[PDB]
Design an enzyme around this catalytic site. Structure first.
Site, PDB file in Angstrom:
ATOM      1  CG  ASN A 169      -5.567  29.253 -63.706  1.00 36.12           C
ATOM      2  OD1 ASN A 169      -4.733  28.598 -63.058  1.00 36.12           O
ATOM      3  ND2 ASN A 169      -6.605  28.719 -64.327  1.00 36.12           N
ATOM      4  CG  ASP A 227      -7.446  34.561 -64.228  1.00 39.54           C
ATOM      5  OD1 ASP A 227      -7.002  33.504 -63.797  1.00 39.54           O
ATOM      6  OD2 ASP A 227      -8.608  34.938 -64.043  1.00 39.54           O
ATOM      7  CG  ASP A 242      -7.238  19.610 -67.628  1.00 34.77           C
ATOM      8  OD1 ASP A 242      -6.162  19.059 -67.378  1.00 34.77           O
ATOM      9  OD2 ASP A 242      -8.129  19.792 -66.790  1.00 34.77           O
ATOM     10  CG  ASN A 299      -7.948  34.414 -60.146  1.00 34.76           C
ATOM     11  OD1 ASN A 299      -7.102  33.842 -60.857  1.00 34.76           O
ATOM     12  ND2 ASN A 299      -9.015  35.001 -60.637  1.00 34.76           N
ATOM     13  CG  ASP A 308      -6.658  31.059 -56.122  1.00 31.92           C
ATOM     14  OD1 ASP A 308      -6.297  32.102 -56.707  1.00 31.92           O
ATOM     15  OD2 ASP A 308      -6.554  29.925 -56.636  1.00 31.92           O
ATOM     16  CB  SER A 316      -4.055  31.876 -59.034  1.00 29.31           C
ATOM     17  OG  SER A 316      -5.444  32.058 -59.152  1.00 29.31           O
ATOM     18  CD  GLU A 335     -11.976  34.542 -69.590  1.00 24.01           C
ATOM     19  OE1 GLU A 335     -11.700  35.344 -68.672  1.00 24.01           O
ATOM     20  OE2 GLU A 335     -12.622  33.443 -69.381  1.00 24.01           O
TER      21      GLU A 335
END
Ligand code: NA
Length: 129
Positions: free
Chosen positions: A59, A52, A101, A46, A48, A50, A35
């Site tokens: 994110n 990280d 989650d 990202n 979209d 967003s 990562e």
């Protein structure tokens, strides 16, 4: 801060990530390697819009507030900037919520693609833990 491999394994262990939700410490170190290359200041934008953040590239769509991700949540109740600290406490506390989650560490696409099913114990080999 750029952590050493065994330095990060020790910090993660101290914050209770070792075997958290059944994921051995080498899983967490492997995910952090791919990562962020162990850099707390890593960021990635990202498609979209967003972003990280940090050693585990958490994110802004769900987990932290950066003020610039329309429609997003802040389920870890932190500014995304907290995930870039030399102190990994915010990253570890938020990673615990994420891995709880439902999809475990599959939440981290790089863990699923590069760590899952591999000899992850190699990531803590020779570390004094
Ligand atoms: Na957010």
């Amino acid at each position: 801060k750029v952590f050493g491999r065994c330095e990060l394994a020790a910090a993660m262990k101290r914050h209770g990530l070792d075997n958290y939700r059944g994921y051995s410490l080498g899983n967490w170190v492997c995910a952090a390697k791919f990562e962020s290359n162990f850099n707390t200041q890593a960021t990635n934008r990202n498609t979209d819009g967003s972003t990280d953040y940090g050693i585990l590239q958490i994110n802004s769509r769900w987990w932290c507030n950066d003020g610039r991700t329309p429609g997003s949540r802040n389920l870890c109740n932190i500014p995304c900037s907290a995930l870039l600290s030399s102190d990994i406490t915010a990253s570890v506390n938020c990673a615990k919520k994420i891995v709880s989650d439902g999809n475990g560490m599959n939440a981290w696409v790089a863990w699923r693609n590069r760590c899952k099913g591999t000899d992850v114990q190699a990531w803590i080999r020779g570390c004094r833990l």
